[PDB]
Design an enzyme around this catalytic site. Structure first.
Site, PDB file in Angstrom:
ATOM      1  N   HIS A 139       0.827  -1.179   0.000  1.00  0.00           N
ATOM      2  CA  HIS A 139       0.000   0.000   0.000  1.00  0.00           C
ATOM      3  C   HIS A 139       0.872   1.244   0.000  1.00  0.00           C
ATOM      4  O   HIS A 139       0.689   2.155  -0.813  1.00  0.00           O
ATOM      5  CB  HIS A 139      -0.909  -0.043   1.228  1.00  0.00           C
ATOM      6  N   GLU A 140       1.872   1.306   0.884  1.00  0.00           N
ATOM      7  CA  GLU A 140       2.746   2.480   0.936  1.00  0.00           C
ATOM      8  C   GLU A 140       3.603   2.614  -0.324  1.00  0.00           C
ATOM      9  O   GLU A 140       3.759   3.706  -0.841  1.00  0.00           O
ATOM     10  CB  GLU A 140       3.642   2.454   2.181  1.00  0.00           C
ATOM     11  N   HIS A 178       1.538   4.129  -3.048  1.00  0.00           N
ATOM     12  CA  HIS A 178       1.504   5.577  -2.939  1.00  0.00           C
ATOM     13  C   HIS A 178       2.730   6.175  -3.624  1.00  0.00           C
ATOM     14  O   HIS A 178       2.612   7.112  -4.418  1.00  0.00           O
ATOM     15  CB  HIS A 178       1.506   6.051  -1.490  1.00  0.00           C
ATOM     16  N   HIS A 190      -5.538   7.155  -2.190  1.00  0.00           N
ATOM     17  CA  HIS A 190      -6.563   6.264  -1.665  1.00  0.00           C
ATOM     18  C   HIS A 190      -7.758   6.180  -2.604  1.00  0.00           C
ATOM     19  O   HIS A 190      -8.131   7.129  -3.293  1.00  0.00           O
ATOM     20  CB  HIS A 190      -7.022   6.768  -0.307  1.00  0.00           C
ATOM     21  N   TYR A 220      -9.739   2.731   2.278  1.00  0.00           N
ATOM     22  CA  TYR A 220      -9.913   2.658   3.719  1.00  0.00           C
ATOM     23  C   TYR A 220     -10.980   1.633   4.109  1.00  0.00           C
ATOM     24  O   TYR A 220     -11.947   1.367   3.351  1.00  0.00           O
ATOM     25  CB  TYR A 220     -10.368   3.994   4.278  1.00  0.00           C
TER      26      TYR A 220
HETATM   27 ZN   LIG Z   1      -2.498   5.168   2.382  1.00  0.00          ZN
END
Ligand SMILES: [Zn+2]
Length: 198
Positions: free
Chosen positions: A98-99, A102, A108, A154
């Site tokens: 996930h990071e 980014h 997101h 999220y």
């Molecule tokens: Zn994030």
């Protein structure tokens, strides 16, 4: 994806059609932590033209650090940029993916410009001062659909003001699951390949 017409916000691709994203990892990370980081990297390597490579002399690189939470900059920001994987809370393959995603230039999922068609934000349930995390962002959606299963989405209780309160409700079907941290979704992977022309 981030909007950046000239593509300066993204990692360059070499003459072998490989996007080399250099990184360093803090000495604080254990051998087991490094295995988890390798597992995350291996998902990108298996299905995209991105290669995370140990940094040598490159000016622009990721520094994986044990800071206060799990976070990254969005896209290539110039010079050293931090990816925090707090050793208490963040060293899991899906969180690392996930990071890193980014860092490749992705926001997101619920920040998508069209997000209001897919989720309701329950602003009264968000911790004070955390609402900024639920802002729509200036997204290039790359002609892909909204993906409730994105690794970038999220969960329902993100930043809840009190435990268990729901800050995000999928619509019109509230029972759809959001917030998986198993790994990059099929659509997440498509978006990488599209952005970098793999
Ligand atoms: Zn994030």
């Amino acid at each position: 994806a981030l909007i950046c017409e000239d593509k300066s916000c993204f990692w360059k691709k070499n003459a072998n059609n490989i996007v080399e994203v250099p990184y360093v990892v803090s000495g604080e990370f254990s051998i087991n932590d490094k295995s988890v980081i390798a597992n995350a990297i291996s998902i990108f390597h298996a299905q995209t033209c991105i290669r995370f490579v140990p940094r040598s002399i490159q000016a622009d690189y990721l520094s994986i650090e044990n800071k206060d939470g799990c976070y990254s900059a969005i896209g290539r920001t110039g010079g050293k940029q931090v990816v925090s994987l707090n050793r208490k809370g963040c060293v899991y393959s899906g969180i690392a993916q996930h990071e890193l995603n980014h860092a490749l230039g992705f926001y997101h999922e619920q920040s998508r410009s069209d997000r209001d068609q897919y989720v309701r934000i329950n602003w009264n349930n968000i911790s004070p001062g955390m609402a900024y995390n639920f802002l729509k962002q200036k997204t290039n959606n790359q002609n892909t659909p909204y993906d409730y299963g994105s690794l970038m989405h999220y969960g329902k209780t993100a930043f809840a003001i009190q435990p268990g309160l729901e800050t995000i409700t999928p619509i019109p079907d509230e029972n759809v699951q959001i917030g998986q941290r198993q790994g990059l979704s099929k659509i997440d992977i498509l978006r990488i390949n599209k952005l970098y022309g793999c």
